[PDB]
Amino acid sequence: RHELIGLSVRIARSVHRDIQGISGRVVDETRNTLRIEMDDGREITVPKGIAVFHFRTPQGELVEIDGRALVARPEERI
């Protein structure tokens, strides 16, 4: 599986319009918050409360994640 720290991620629609349709790299993932960082050294946060986005791996992989319908709470228990 391998974590997703550094991978690329694109948003199709998010709770906030300021981030809606945003695109960038990954840094960290939270139960209700998506953290975006790019190897360039640029980091930016993006709430997961209602944000669908797919990740891209240089190796040639296509991953998808839902911030609207797949909002799960791990450490916080279900």
Curated annotation (Swiss-Prot):
GO CC annotations, alphabetized: cytoplasm; ribonuclease P complex
Up-regulation conditions: Constitutively expressed (at protein level).
Keywords: Cytoplasm, Endonuclease, Hydrolase, Nuclease, tRNA processing
Any single biological process term in GO: tRNA 5'-leader removal
Primary subcellular site in the record, as a coarse category: cytoplasm
Reactions that this protein is recorded to catalyse: Endonucleolytic cleavage of RNA, removing 5'-extranucleotides from tRNA precursor
Source organism superkingdom: Archaea
Subcellular location: Cytoplasm
Enzyme class: hydrolase
One annotated GO molecular function: ribonuclease P activity
EC number from the UniProt entry: 3.1.26.5
Quaternary structure, from the entry: Consists of a catalytic RNA component and at least 4-5 protein subunits.
Function in brief: Part of ribonuclease P, a protein complex that generates mature tRNA molecules by cleaving their 5'-ends.
Family listed: Belongs to the eukaryotic/archaeal RNase P protein component 1 family.
Protein name: Ribonuclease P protein component 1
Native organism taxonomy: Archaea, Methanobacteriati, Methanobacteriota, Methanomada group, Methanobacteria
Gene name of the encoded protein: rnp1
